Design a protein around this nucleic acid. Structure first.
Ligand SMILES: Nc1nc2c(ncn2[C@@H]2O[C@H](COP(=O)(O)OP(=O)(O)OP(=O)(O)O)[C@@H](O)[C@H]2O)c(=O)[nH]1
Ligand SMILES: [Mg+2]
Ligand SMILES: [Mg+2]
Ligand SMILES: [Mg+2]
Ligand SMILES: [Mg+2]
Ligand SMILES: [Mg+2]
Ligand SMILES: [Mg+2]
Ligand SMILES: [Mg+2]
Ligand SMILES: [Mg+2]
Ligand SMILES: [Mg+2]
Ligand SMILES: [Mg+2]
Ligand SMILES: [Mg+2]
Ligand SMILES: [Mg+2]
Ligand SMILES: [Mg+2]
Ligand SMILES: [Mg+2]
Ligand SMILES: [Mg+2]
Ligand SMILES: [Mg+2]
Ligand SMILES: [Mg+2]
Ligand SMILES: [Mg+2]
Ligand SMILES: [Mg+2]
Ligand SMILES: [Mg+2]
Ligand SMILES: [Mg+2]
Ligand SMILES: [Mg+2]
Ligand SMILES: [Mg+2]
Ligand SMILES: [Mg+2]
Ligand SMILES: [Mg+2]
Ligand SMILES: [Mg+2]
Ligand SMILES: [Mg+2]
Ligand SMILES: [Mg+2]
Ligand SMILES: [Mg+2]
Lengths: 148, 117, 190, 16, 95, 166, 97, 243
RNA sequence: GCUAAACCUAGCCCCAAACCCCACCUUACUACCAGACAACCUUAGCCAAACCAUUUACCCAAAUAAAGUAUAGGCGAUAGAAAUUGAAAUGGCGCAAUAGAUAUAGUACCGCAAGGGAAAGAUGAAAAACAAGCAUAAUAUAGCAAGGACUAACCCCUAUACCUUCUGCAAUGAAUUAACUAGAAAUAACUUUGCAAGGAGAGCCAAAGCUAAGACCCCCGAAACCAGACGAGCUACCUAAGAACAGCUAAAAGAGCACACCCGUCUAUGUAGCAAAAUAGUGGGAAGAUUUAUAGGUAGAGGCGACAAACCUACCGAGCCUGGUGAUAGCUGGUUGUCCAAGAUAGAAUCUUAGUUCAACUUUAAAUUUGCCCACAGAACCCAAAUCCCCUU
RNA sequence: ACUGAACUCCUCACACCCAAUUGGACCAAUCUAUCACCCUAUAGAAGAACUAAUGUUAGUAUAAGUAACAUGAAAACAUUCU
RNA sequence: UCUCUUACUUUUAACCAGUGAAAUUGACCUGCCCGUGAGAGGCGGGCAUAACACAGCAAGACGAGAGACCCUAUGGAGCUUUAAUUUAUUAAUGCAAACAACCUGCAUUAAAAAUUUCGGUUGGGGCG
């Protein structure tokens, strides 16, 4: 603990205290960096690379419509509605090597991702899900056990 | 300063020592001049019986046979004192058989008990 | 450790009876300064850093780690020649002497852990034989554990128990990351 | 002024 | 700060930090320059341009802010049109 | 507490061979819990150390200290038991081989002082121990003679070695 | 003199009493029983620390939360004081900050 | 150790044990049930959800009632759910100023009220809120019979309620005797509030008063065992004779 | 060989389960007379904010999660939800007489009271069987008491006790023995596993992550503040009803001298005392505003006061006890096994200079490649010493 | 010239002399698992180590057998005397 | 009282007998001169030096147990204020309320108080 002093006694000031000089984190002005952060909508990215990888490994079946439930079941994406996740957004990454004909339903979709999906002969639709519906979609079995 | 010793009439000043007693039951009252009037009826009169010719003794011979204790009960007393007459009169107003509705009017009331011992 | 709940507890200087008033003034008495007769320094005082309340030692290794431990225990027994497979646990008689003599003749260890598929179907003969034995312990398949496997010198398994253990442990391999507790319904999980 | 402190009386009353 | 709250036993976040600093998931902390809204009439254009900029924090400052904020603020946030999405990660960084 | 002194009288030696010197008798006696300071008793014990029983009794009979009477009683009891039980032929043929005083079990009392302060008196008790050995008292150690001193010095001189060398 | 002058009575431990012999059985109840029961459900002890762990402050908070209403008067007072003291200690004292 | 039950359930357990158990079921239910009194000293929120201006998001809102202190003098009067507000204020209404204890008391008036059912005039210390409530109820009798226990919040008010309810239940001819038509008119006017007398007897009784009433009801001097044994012996003899 | 030393169970701790004759409110423990008074009412403060003044977590009616999120806040210290989700159900890696309950006991003892509050016992199947301190044994020129030694105890030579606080010794603490007596934890990081673009037994994290484990955060001490009790048997004053005041001089006296009585001017004794304010002498008053016994009253953000800030149960510029309370203390003191290793003075801000934060220095682990020394050449006019830079080596 | 260190050489062996701090290797005793069975091993734990707080309790020292204390005289122990 | 002290008696005292504390105490096998140190029994150079008792003394052991002075603390408390913040409380008025008064609410003015503080440098003090 060192020699006698406030720290050795174990009563040093709180974290961020600077001995009386105005603390750094209080002398920096307030700015709305995180204003409304808990209300901003979040969409988990689902790159075409990831989608093609899932289809290739058979964790997602392109012979049937692909929606958030199928993605979650195949573990292609993790959705956290409690953390303001509003669904999945298609991402153009991997577009040049996407060669799957799929019927995928997402929440957001980039122009290039839509172009790749449609060029491969598939169909893509952007569908909205409120937080409650999104939670039910992502984890249907617990909802069924809720008995509602 | 002594909290544990019992509080008796030997402890306080003159007034305390005179006022407190030793549990002896009162015999009368005090009139003017501190003259004590003793009421005869307040004095317990010992109803001592005539023991002449009595056969019992403080002790019982060990030769007496052993018996089983049977504490008397209200039902047993009723059976041994009331049931005979009740049965006889029924075969042939409960006051006639011994029942007394109100203890009031008796010298020896059973409740609230108004006699000694 | 995970089941452990140490019930040891001691009274701190706040909980020791009395000790409110200052024993003597700060200065004048020529004695050491004190604030109560129940500080840790005093006889009968509190304990400065003693055990506090019932303490849990609960923690969970990953279920994959625990299944791997079970697999490793089984492999260790097999490689060290302490694992014996049985067609069934049926015994000619429920006499514990028969079981002890059989173990001694076959050169099993002083301690044997017999395992059967389920509790309900375990033969009455073996049940009676092992109920009266201390070093011969009979458990259902669901009760198999590394601790008992290591405590008992030899491990005896039935063929259904072998199949059950293989299925259950191999399932941990090649399973998805859970979406929710496996107690809940799954497409292919009984 | 600091008053004198008497020790407990039992400590000086024990007998064989 | 409060290392163990009295109701949950959790570590609390100093909201004065949240109201002032942005954390990039890479670990950098961004801030405004103090006095960027003060007495601009007596500040030269270069000084005003310097003050109007978003600025990174020191290593020790970033460590202090990380200590003062909890893990919830140090997660991945996939906001829709975040202006700092590109800045949330580092590229071509050697040691 | 320890009571080994009393037990010391119960040791039985094996019979002596005819061609062996007669073992002098030894009698251990003591008095416990004497209301007297062991420091004060030590002086009487030291005084009577090494003296014959009769000489010790004579010296104690004319000593003003309270402990003298107690020691005299103890010595008389020791003499009586030596004659009766330890097969000592002559009463007077005994000398005090050992005599010591030991601390007894003491009691603590309070001594009131002037200003509400106090001290801790100790009601001091002491033990007294004696060993009586049969036979005339051993002669006192003669004082060192000049001849003996010179002999010792010359022995020390002869004992010299060439130190720290081959 | 703080040492005993005689050997203490021999301590005989039955390593094969039922408790030791069956110790640990059903620890794998979850992974070997289709996860019907969690292993922590095998824990027997205070209601407020079954399948849970924390430092002294967290333990005291949980105890007050879960059985505080059922606690005796002076025990609850001591628990409240302990929570207060532990809050002050953990949130205001220590080498690191 | 730990109590088997939470300390806050001890009153309910005591109610389920003893003479309180023997108390009539309807009275026990009335005691057990608790309803929030009508807001008096605070303005309730209109809806359960509100769009908070700060972040413009929908948030749940709750109506947390202001604690009210009712001095015993209130129990002798009819305060329309009004009482003393024992709270605190910020000097000059700014939180950066001193905090001061503040007691807001209601303005009490002495007024005379006539009860049609009771055919009596009562002088009652009353509040303007109580007068307004009486006007809204169209009379003291209607106000007393309508206002529940929590809103009435007056032992005298509950006693008046019990008296009126008992009068209605019994159809007592003591109401305007020699004027049966007027009595019937009053009873018809207040018909809707009539309830069985067995229930009206227990309206507005405190727990202690109900316990005392039950004790008085169920107190009986023990029957002498002479009567019981005579009846038993006579019955036994009847059976013996018949068989 | 004395004092002593030794013991194992009396019991206790944490959980689970389970809901639990007579007398006595008057002076309590008092057989026996005309009632009437009856209860409810925000806690505060310490403390944190390094002052403090708004503010500062606290039996709440399901654990977990949402979440330390929304929000609140000298927008600062800090405080902090809800919607929503919905788990389960037999003792001890506790103490063993300075421990564990204070407990052999709320007893003894202490206090007027509220309150405070101990200590200790050890045979046997049967009782109808080795600490300190001393002694044995006082001591020999000279010296931190030992070491090198030596034939030899000493003699010879060498040697400035320990801890802590300072730049350094002086200063602090220690009679000594036994027992007891003081580092509690998150953020991340590091190591070791598991699995791996996925990890985790819901929630959470994830651009190699994730899960789990290991591993870091002391003790004693104020004057204080506030809440509620208890105190006017001392003392201050007062109320009721009492009592005392010899003798002489004067005469109806807040008169004089002087007993008892009250007080306490000066000296001496005493100073752990006879005494926690006394004794002897000397002295002031001693029929008055006197002294005094009895009962009652005034109670602490108060009482009472011929103001001395005096007295209010020996310690009153704000009593005592209990509680908040383990108050707080940037201050003092302490902070216990062995061994090795690296390891020293640059400033800045600060109600700040007895402190802290940053820097600098120091330590550990890791990545990479240049680091130091330094040849020329080079670094200002106004008008010494050296320093920086720097290829080689 | 010689004497003269823990400098240097010599035979052998080497981690074995810095405050605060920091890294590391071991470890007494206790309990638990399993060993062991005249007192141990591998691990898991923790009220886990005292030459020092005018530290707490108990014992005994030092001062010290010191300061201090006490019982008028004779006697027939009747009594008398001061 | 003193020049100028003396004699005696009692207590005390010292010896014998009984009983038997307290402060204090790191260990002490505990010397003097000079020097060093800013102050020496313990360090350096010299000198002295068998061992212990008993009674005195008060030069040293910065003698022991309790004392004052200066400075510090973002430590208290008492007191005063034209220090800051308040009027919670009382007393007044005014306006509402209600039928002049009382009560309640809101204001204003006083009295009484309540909480808290009293920065830094400049030997102190005054003015600076
Ligand atoms: N954890 C715990 N278990 C206890 C406690 N007291 C008793 N038990 C358990 O109670 C069970 C039954 O106790 P027993 O005394 O054998 O039987 P019992 O008298 O029928 O038991 P109860 O009905 O509980 O009184 C056993 O498993 C005990 O270990 C206790 O204080 N704590
Ligand atoms: Mg420091
Ligand atoms: Mg306490
Ligand atoms: Mg204890
Ligand atoms: Mg006294
Ligand atoms: Mg503060
Ligand atoms: Mg005890
Ligand atoms: Mg010894
Ligand atoms: Mg000392
Ligand atoms: Mg008085
Ligand atoms: Mg006169
Ligand atoms: Mg006069
Ligand atoms: Mg004055
Ligand atoms: Mg003055
Ligand atoms: Mg006092
Ligand atoms: Mg402290
Ligand atoms: Mg080194
Ligand atoms: Mg400042
Ligand atoms: Mg400071
Ligand atoms: Mg040399
Ligand atoms: Mg310890
Ligand atoms: Mg020790
Ligand atoms: Mg000590
Ligand atoms: Mg002595
Ligand atoms: Mg002396
Ligand atoms: Mg003397
Ligand atoms: Mg003497
Ligand atoms: Mg000198
Ligand atoms: Mg002398
Ligand atoms: Mg000295």
């Amino acid at each position: 603990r060192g020699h006698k002093g406030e720290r050795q006694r174990g009563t040093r000031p709180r974290l961020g205290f600077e001995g009386g000089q105005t603390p750094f984190y209080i002398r920096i002005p307030k700015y709305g960096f995180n204003e409304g952060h808990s209300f901003r909508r979040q969409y988990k990215p689902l790159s075409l690379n990831r989608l093609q990888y899932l289809i290739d490994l058979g964790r997602v079946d392109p012979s049937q419509p692909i929606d958030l439930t199928q993605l979650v079941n195949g573990r292609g994406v993790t959705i956290q509605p409690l953390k303001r996740d509003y669904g999945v957004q298609l991402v153009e990454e991997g577009a040049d090597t996407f060669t799957a004909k799929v019927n995928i339903e997402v929440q957001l979709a980039s122009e290039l991702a839509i172009a790749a999906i449609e060029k491969n002969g598939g169909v893509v639709t952007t569908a909205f899900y409120d937080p409650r519906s999104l939670d039910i979609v992502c984890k249907p079995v617990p909802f069924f056990l809720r008995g509602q | 300063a002594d909290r544990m010793s019992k509080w008796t009439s030997k402890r306080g000043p003159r007034s305390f020592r005179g006022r407190k007693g030793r549990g002896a039951k009162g015999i009368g009252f005090l009139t003017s001049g501190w003259r004590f009037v003793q009421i005869k009826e307040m004095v317990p009169e010992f109803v001592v019986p005539d023991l002449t010719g009595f056969k019992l003794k403080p002790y019982v011979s060990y030769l007496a046979p052993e018996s089983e204790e049977t504490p008397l009960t209200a039902a047993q007393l009723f059976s041994e004192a009331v049931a005979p007459a009740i049965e006889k009169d029924f075969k042939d107003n409960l006051e006639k058989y011994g029942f007394e509705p109100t203890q009031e009017g008796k010298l020896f009331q059973l409740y609230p008990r108004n006699f000694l011992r | 450790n995970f089941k452990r709940i140490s019930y040891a507890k001691t009274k701190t200087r706040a909980e020791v009876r009395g000790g409110g008033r200052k024993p003597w003034p700060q200065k004048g008495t020529g004695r050491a300064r004190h604030g109560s007769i129940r500080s840790p320094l005093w006889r009968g005082g509190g304990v400065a850093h003693g055990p506090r309340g019932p303490t849990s030692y609960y923690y969970m290794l990953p279920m994959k780690v625990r299944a791997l431990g079970l697999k490793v225990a089984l492999t260790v027994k097999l490689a060290q020649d302490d694992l014996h497979i049985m067609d069934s646990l049926e015994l000619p008689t429920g006499d514990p002497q028969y079981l002890t003599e059989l173990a001694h003749y076959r050169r099993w260890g002083d301690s044997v852990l017999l395992v059967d598929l389920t509790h309900e179907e375990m033969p009455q003969s073996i049940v009676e034989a092992t109920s009266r034995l201390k070093t011969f312990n009979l458990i259902p398949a669901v009760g198999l554990n590394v601790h008992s496997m290591l405590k008992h010198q030899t491990l005896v398994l039935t063929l259904p128990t072998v199949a059950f253990l293989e299925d259950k442990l191999l399932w941990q391999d090649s399973r998805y990351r859970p979406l929710y507790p496996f107690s809940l319904p799954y497409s292919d999980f009984p | 002024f600091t008053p004198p402190i008497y020790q407990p009386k039992f400590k000086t009353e024990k007998e064989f | 700060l409060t290392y163990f709250s009295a109701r949950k036993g959790k570590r609390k976040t100093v909201k004065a930090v949240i109201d002032r600093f942005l954390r990039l998931h890479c670990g950098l902390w961004v801030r405004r320059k103090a006095g960027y809204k003060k007495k601009l009439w007596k500040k030269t254009p270069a000084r005003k341009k310097r003050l109007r900029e978003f600025v990174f924090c020191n290593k020790t400052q970033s460590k202090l802010l990380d200590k003062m904020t909890t893990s919830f603020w140090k997660r991945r946030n996939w906001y829709v049109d975040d202006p700092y999405q590109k800045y949330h990660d580092r590229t071509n960084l050697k040691v | 507490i320890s009571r080994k002194w009393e037990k010391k009288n119960k040791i039985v030696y094996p019979p002596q061979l005819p061609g062996e010197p007669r073992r002098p008798a030894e009698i251990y006696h003591c008095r416990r819990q004497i209301k007297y300071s062991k420091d004060k008793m030590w002086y009487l014990a030291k005084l009577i150390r090494g003296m014959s029983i009769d000489q010790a009794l004579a010296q104690l009979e004319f000593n003003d200290k309270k402990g003298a009477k107690i020691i005299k009683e103890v010595l008389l009891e020791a003499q009586d038991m030596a004659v009766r039980d330890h097969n000592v032929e002559f009463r007077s043929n005994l000398y005090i081989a050992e005599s010591t005083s030991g601390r007894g079990q003491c009691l603590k009392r309070i001594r009131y002082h002037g200003r509400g302060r106090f001290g801790i008196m100790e009601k001091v008790y002491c033990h007294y121990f004696v060993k009586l050995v049969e036979g005339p008292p051993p002669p006192p150690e003669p004082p060192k003679t000049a001849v003996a001193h010179a002999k010792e010095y010359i022995q020390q001189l002869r004992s010299r070695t060439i130190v720290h060398t081959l | 003199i703080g040492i005993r002058l005689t050997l203490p009575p021999p301590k005989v431990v039955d390593r094969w009493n039922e408790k030791r012999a069956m110790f640990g059985v059903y620890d794998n109840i979850g992974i070997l029983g289709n996860f019907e029961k969690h292993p922590k459900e095998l824990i027997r002890g205070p209601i407020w620390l079954r399948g849970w762990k924390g430092n002294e402050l967290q333990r005291c908070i949980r105890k007050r939360k879960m059985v505080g209403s059922r606690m005796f008067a002076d025990d609850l007072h001591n628990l409240n004081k302990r929570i207060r003291y532990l809050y002050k200690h953990f949130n205001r004292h220590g080498k690191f900050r | 150790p730990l109590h088997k039950y939470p300390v806050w359930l001890w009153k309910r357990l005591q109610l389920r044990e003893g003479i309180c158990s023997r108390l009539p079921g309807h009275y026990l239910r009335s005691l057990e049930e608790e309803r929030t009194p009508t807001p008096v000293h605070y303005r309730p929120h209109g809806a359960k959800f509100k769009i908070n201006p700060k972040n413009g998001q929908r948030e749940r809102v709750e109506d947390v009632p202001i604690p009210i202190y009712f001095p015993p003098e209130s129990q002798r009067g009819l305060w329309g759910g009004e009482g003393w507000i024992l709270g605190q204020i910020y000097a000059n209404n700014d939180k950066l100023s001193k905090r001061l204890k503040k007691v807001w008391k209601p303005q009490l008036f002495e007024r005379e009220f006539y009860s049609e059912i009771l055919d009596k005039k009562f002088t009652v210390t009353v509040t303007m809120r109580t007068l307004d409530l009486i006007d809204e109820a169209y009379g003291l009798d209607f106000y007393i019979l309508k206002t529940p226990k929590e809103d009435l919040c007056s032992k005298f008010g509950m006693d008046l309620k019990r008296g009126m309810l008992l009068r209605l239940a019994r159809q007592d001819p003591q109401l305007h005797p020699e004027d049966p038509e007027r009595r019937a008119a009053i009873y018809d006017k207040y018909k809707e509030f009539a309830i069985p007398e067995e229930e009206a007897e227990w309206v507005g009784l405190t727990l202690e008063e109900a316990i005392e009433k039950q004790r008085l009801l169920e107190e009986k001097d023990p029957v002498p065992l002479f009567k019981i044994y005579v009846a038993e012996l006579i019955q036994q003899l009847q059976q013996q004779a018949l068989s």
